[PDB]
Amino acid sequence: PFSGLKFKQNSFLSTVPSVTNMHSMHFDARETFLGVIRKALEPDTSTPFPVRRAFDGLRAEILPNDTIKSAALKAQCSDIDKHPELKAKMETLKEVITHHPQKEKLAEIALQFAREAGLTRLKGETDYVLSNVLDGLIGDGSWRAGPAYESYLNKP
Amino acid sequence: PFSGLKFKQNSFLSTVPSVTNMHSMHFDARETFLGVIRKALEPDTSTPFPVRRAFDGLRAEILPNDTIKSAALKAQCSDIDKHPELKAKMETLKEVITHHPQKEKLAEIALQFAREAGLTRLKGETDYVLSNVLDGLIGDGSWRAGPAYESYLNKP
Amino acid sequence: TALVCDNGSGLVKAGFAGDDAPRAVFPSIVGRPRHQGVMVGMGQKDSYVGDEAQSKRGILTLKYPIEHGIITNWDDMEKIWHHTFYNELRVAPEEHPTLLTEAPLNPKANREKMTQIMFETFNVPAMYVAIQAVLSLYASGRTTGIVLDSGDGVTHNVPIYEGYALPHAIMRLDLAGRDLTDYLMKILTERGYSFVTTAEREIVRDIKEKLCYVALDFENEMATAASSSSLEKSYELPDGQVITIGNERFRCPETLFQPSFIGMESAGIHETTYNSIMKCDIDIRKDLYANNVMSGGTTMYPGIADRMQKEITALAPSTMKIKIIAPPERKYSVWIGGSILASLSTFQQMWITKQEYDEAGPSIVHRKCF
Amino acid sequence: TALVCDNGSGLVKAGFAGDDAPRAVFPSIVGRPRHQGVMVGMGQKDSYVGDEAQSKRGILTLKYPIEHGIITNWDDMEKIWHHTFYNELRVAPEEHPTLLTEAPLNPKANREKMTQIMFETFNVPAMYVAIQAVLSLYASGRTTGIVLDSGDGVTHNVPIYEGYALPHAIMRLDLAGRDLTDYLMKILTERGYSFVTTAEREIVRDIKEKLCYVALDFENEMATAASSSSLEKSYELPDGQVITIGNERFRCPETLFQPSFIGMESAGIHETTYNSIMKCDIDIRKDLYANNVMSGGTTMYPGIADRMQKEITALAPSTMKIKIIAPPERKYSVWIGGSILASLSTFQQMWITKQEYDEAGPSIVHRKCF
Amino acid sequence: TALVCDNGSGLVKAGFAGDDAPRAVFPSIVGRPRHQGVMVGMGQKDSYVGDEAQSKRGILTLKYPIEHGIITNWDDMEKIWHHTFYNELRVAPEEHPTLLTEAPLNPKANREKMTQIMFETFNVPAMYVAIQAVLSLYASGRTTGIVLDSGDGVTHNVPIYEGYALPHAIMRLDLAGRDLTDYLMKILTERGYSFVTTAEREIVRDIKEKLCYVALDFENEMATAASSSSLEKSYELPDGQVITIGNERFRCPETLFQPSFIGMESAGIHETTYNSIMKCDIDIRKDLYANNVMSGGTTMYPGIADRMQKEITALAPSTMKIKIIAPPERKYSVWIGGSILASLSTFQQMWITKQEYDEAGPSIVHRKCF
Numbered sequence A, B: 001p002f003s004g005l006k007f008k009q010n011s012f013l014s015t016v017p018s019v020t021n022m023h024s025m026h027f028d029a030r031e032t033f034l035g036v037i038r039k040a041l042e043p044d045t046s047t048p049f050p051v052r053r054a055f056d057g058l059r060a061e062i063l064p065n066d067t068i069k070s071a072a073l074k075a076q077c078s079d080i081d082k083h084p085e086l087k088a089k090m091e092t093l094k095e096v097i098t099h100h101p102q103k104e105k106l107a108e109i110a111l112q113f114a115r116e117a118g119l120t121r122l123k124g125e126t127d128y129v130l131s132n133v134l135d136g137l138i139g140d141g142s143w144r145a146g147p148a149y150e151s152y153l154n155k156p
Numbered sequence C, D, E: 001t002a003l004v005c006d007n008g009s010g011l012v013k014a015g016f017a018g019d020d021a022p023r024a025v026f027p028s029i030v031g032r033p034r035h036q037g038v039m040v041g042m043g044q045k046d047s048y049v050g051d052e053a054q055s056k057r058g059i060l061t062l063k064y065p066i067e068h069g070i071i072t073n074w075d076d077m078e079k080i081w082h083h084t085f086y087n088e089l090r091v092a093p094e095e096h097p098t099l100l101t102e103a104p105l106n107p108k109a110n111r112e113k114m115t116q117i118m119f120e121t122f123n124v125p126a127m128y129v130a131i132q133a134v135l136s137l138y139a140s141g142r143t144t145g146i147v148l149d150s151g152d153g154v155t156h157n158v159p160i161y162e163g164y165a166l167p168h169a170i171m172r173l174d175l176a177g178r179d180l181t182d183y184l185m186k187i188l189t190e191r192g193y194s195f196v197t198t199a200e201r202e203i204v205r206d207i208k209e210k211l212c213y214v215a216l217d218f219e220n221e222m223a224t225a226a227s228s229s230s231l232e233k234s235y236e237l238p239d240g241q242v243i244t245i246g247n248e249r250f251r252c253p254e255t256l257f258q259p260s261f262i263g264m265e266s267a268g269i270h271e272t273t274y275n276s277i278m279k280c281d282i283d284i285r286k287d288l289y290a291n292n293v294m295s296g297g298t299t300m301y302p303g304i305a306d307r308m309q310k311e312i313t314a315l316a317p318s319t320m321k322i323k324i325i326a327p328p329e330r331k332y333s334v335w336i337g338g339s340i341l342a343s344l345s346t347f348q349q350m351w352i353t354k355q356e357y358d359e360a361g362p363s364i365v366h367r368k369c370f
């Protein structure tokens, strides 16, 4: 679909919030994390314009930087079964993510979000868009039950 | 002595080293600075041939390219009292320098060399050739009193 | 009426065409909280823009969407434009043509994406991307002269004669106010003032704007600073601490004329201006020498105009008449020129229209804009 | 013979040029007695320095004259130097050239007063102040490479290509040991151990030096600690109590790569090293990506080299061959380089002599040393 | 044996007369360090020449002593020649006559000075200055034809018929490889690639040599590049970064046929060649049309010969047979011809001997050499 799509290396590092901020009372892990992925997926200008224009439309729909559109897409995904085109679009984006040249760093950032900001707090009941993005970064899907938290009470 | 002698303006700017390199622990301030003066004294092609050949011999002897010849001249000027011909040549060259159309800029370069590269660190004990060149650029000879320095410590 | 938005690397100058000064002048920064909050009902805003970010910078990580005149964070640049239109100008962008600016020799994708955002995200009826140096000449009112535009990100020279630009003579130098700010941070560590962290880069920018100046003769100034201590000046930080600054006052702006001290191989702004003139036709050089127009915040240092006059005079032949034009409003000259250009009747056919855009795509910007 | 390099924030390293290792290390500590004095014989001295101040730490108030590479108590620093020359090296300083060190981007008054004390209160025939990163390269034997030197007060990067440093690419973070130590004692409170200031800080430093390590994958390591007890390890306090430390023994050095753990806004040491590169010339980066030299005690954590190798392999083009050089004598690389440098016959001209100092005053050190 | 030194603007091709290829081919650059210090025994060598300067390119400021076929820095040129004789050829110049080349319509002081240096600085027994275009004809083996020599500094064509040159028909354009290199780095900024240093200019030169080609029809090629990505090629920079260029591949060489791209008013090389032929006698134009011989590196672009064939055929009358001769050894045609000329027995009387120089001085070159 997107042949020759290229990404700017390390373009997403500035978007990662401070670890201390991830513990904030009103931190929005989902939107902040999807902001990192949206920045990570910003095609490099080296990409041919036709591919750049096509992909930008895809990530605009699935990863909009506008809050009201992100909320609407989330609600529109509560019945993903009723939007076959949306399901296919997310699969196509999911395919792009899993091939990302820095998927390892993005997966590392995703796990940091999960442990610090509770990104995967809902586990299996995580939103369709967020769950599929995490699936691309972490193929096995273990993130659904992977946030092992240390306990200090009653330990040797 | 040299009537009609002309110089290509701004010809010497390319020869001035970067201030960063002037701080090199093995920077040769004298040879590098004399290279700037040699380049600045290169006769313009518009000068009549008899003057060019006459002057080129003067600066070639007093400002040679070769390090061996430059060092030999340096030693021979340590006892300049026994070399009147050099006294006349150095005096003749200094007269040309003080009338150089861009003496002001060459003075700024000389002060930069003293400020950064320690060109005049020997103060009054500077060798005859270098001292005469500086006297041509800086008529009063105040450079013999080395550059003023900040002395950060004990500041108010 | 049309909107004139001079994006700029450091400041956003926005307003309406026909006004003598921009309505809104705020930093081009977006701040994200660093710390944990931590009260209920506090810190629900994920980001702050412009003056609000500057006010709250103590608990924010400030980031400039534009670096070296190039937009590097388009999501943040969208935030800044949204702030400019809705919170600063309080206009509906769908009703007003928007005149934008950028430096010459920028990446083509920068202005291609500027057009796309304006027509799709903001749905402006029409827009136009002007070269900042050209606008400065509009503000000066001249038709001939070489403009030295130096803002926060880019310093570029554009020679113009009788309204004709010589693009092959355009010089661009990625050394501007922000680079001077970083250098001032570096040399301030020579004394005990170790900002040395991204938190206080704005405080030293304020120090630079308040105290730094260009020495007419660098060597004499260095000797005076070393000898007398009469050049020392004191600045009070927000903490109430007082820092004394001596020869760093004129060493920081000296980087403009000696791009060394920050490890740059390029020549100073004086030589870049002279080199630009010498690349032009020999017949227009005399008029360029007498019409050195200076614009941008980085040209606001006291004594820079005098220094530029001295330095160029030393490079140009003696018979030439060097004249530096430094208007008091040269900090807003680019926006003023945009306002003049946007309000010209002859300009109303130069706009890129919405109909033209969706017919041709973002590539239309290259055809209709210099 | 010449006495040789040290200005360490945490440790002194004194010795003779030409030797393969320092003859005396001892901590850079000056302790003052507290809450004692009743017995006539339970201590007559009013201050203890280095070794035998660690021994008496229980009844003393320890404090370092050097904080983040900068000496902040010259009365105590003179005591440490006096202890070094007379009680450790058993030499007379007035007959030995002495080579000292300093972190880059330090306040210049630091060097000025260092040379003033050496020539006036110690009457050394000659001295010299070197940059610790440069010496580390001498010890490694390279003339090319970027050296990441991190001791007890400062971590800094100095890229050198062919003996030529790129000063504009020097990076310095005031984040090293003594900040990991402070974080560790803070992080030990949640486990149930207090370790209040001074005497207990040294205990925490020892447990950091013995038990702490850098995890190759922090998130994976964090899960392992949570789900198992294999990473748990116990340490015996001086009074016989045993403390069990689990994930705290890799979170403490993790602050090197995530300085936001301790509230710092700067990037980690991996990004700072990569940022130091990409500020050098493009043709130099390939040789800097290799020859990534580690030095200083803070680089002695197990697995720090592999993590930095992994981290810098990311952020860099895949075709580049990242190579981290971490010799076993990292902790004394600076001293070894100083010994090599001070023993070179060609270096004997670079000494600043008493004759030059009294002619030029303390400022001479700036125009004679890097 | 005689030495043939083709000291072009960009490359020095040197060797012995009678050989089929030059023995030494290295860049005509002198590089001087621009960074600081800092290691004892690693900075004694000031200035690097040729391949050594190119290898240490990252820390040096490269400068060409020859610009537009004119030697501008004679001190550096002396270094280049000394490097050629003693370090590359390993010969004593006093034992070998030296044949060297220069472009036509050069300043006469250029020949006078190089004659002066060869006899007084190198004590060459004899020397000769030949025209590069004439030597190319020697290499091709013809005695008739209009040569088009385009190197790094200057492009010129010299029409020769039956061994007779028509000096009134010589053409000279200061538009050659270096001007193309500078244009390429200017239009590379359109894709966000910034090359500003002299070190990076060499990388842009390599990119040009590796990827640039001449489009048979420029407008069609521009349309193809705009409509598809088939013309894009990727290039790996020294530090591992990968850059991709599309229409810049053939836009840079297009400046040869459209000098207005870089602001020059001159005509393209195709039209200049036709103008040169049209200035020749009508009876010899037919022979010239069929013997256009290309030489120099700037004629090595793929498709240049076909483009010149097409362009001249559209200018010449339809009944003429336009033939472009572009031997694969184009890049060394000048040196090969010089080697042929220097080894001819009938040429041994055309040398300028040391005795001739003594009686007549440097002005002897104007009498003995074309």
Ligand SMILES: Nc1ncnc2c1ncn2[C@@H]1O[C@H](COP(=O)(O)OP(=O)(O)O)[C@@H](O)[C@H]1O
Binding pocket: C007, C008, C009, C010, C011, C012, C150, C151, C152, C153, C154, C177, C178, C181, C205, C208, C209, C210, C295, C296, C297, C298, C299, C300, C301, C302, C331
């Ligand atoms: N009075 C002043 N003196 C010195 N520097 C100034 C002054 N005013 C502004 N500046 C500098 O100019 C820069 C902003 O200039 P500006 O023309 O707004 O650039 P831009 O158009 O890119 O925003 C800032 O980085 C600031 O440091």
Ligand SMILES: Nc1ncnc2c1ncn2[C@@H]1O[C@H](COP(=O)(O)OP(=O)(O)O)[C@@H](O)[C@H]1O
Binding pocket: D007, D008, D009, D010, D011, D012, D150, D151, D152, D153, D177, D178, D181, D205, D208, D209, D210, D212, D295, D296, D297, D298, D299, D300, D301, D302, D331
């Ligand atoms: N094996 C180790 N593991 C972890 N940290 C160590 C180890 N050894 C020393 N350190 C740390 O390194 C610091 C000493 O480094 P050093 O190079 O001596 O600094 P300085 O040059 O300032 O004396 C101490 O603060 C200590 O905490």
Ligand SMILES: Nc1ncnc2c1ncn2[C@@H]1O[C@H](COP(=O)(O)OP(=O)(O)O)[C@@H](O)[C@H]1O
Binding pocket: E007, E008, E009, E010, E011, E012, E150, E151, E152, E153, E177, E178, E181, E205, E208, E209, E210, E212, E295, E296, E297, E298, E299, E300, E301, E302, E331
């Ligand atoms: N294969 C190639 N393709 C395109 N340009 C080339 C090629 N080889 C060399 N050049 C260009 O030719 C110039 C060198 O040509 P040359 O004949 O050596 O000139 P000179 O005689 O002045 O050294 C260089 O500037 C280079 O950019």
Ligand SMILES: [Mg+2]
Binding pocket: C006, C008, C009, C132, C150, C151, C152, C296, C297, C334
């Ligand atoms: Mg501006």
Ligand SMILES: [Mg+2]
Binding pocket: D008, D132, D150, D151, D152, D296, D297, D334
């Ligand atoms: Mg250390």
Ligand SMILES: [Mg+2]
Binding pocket: E008, E009, E132, E150, E151, E152, E296, E297, E334
């Ligand atoms: Mg040639």
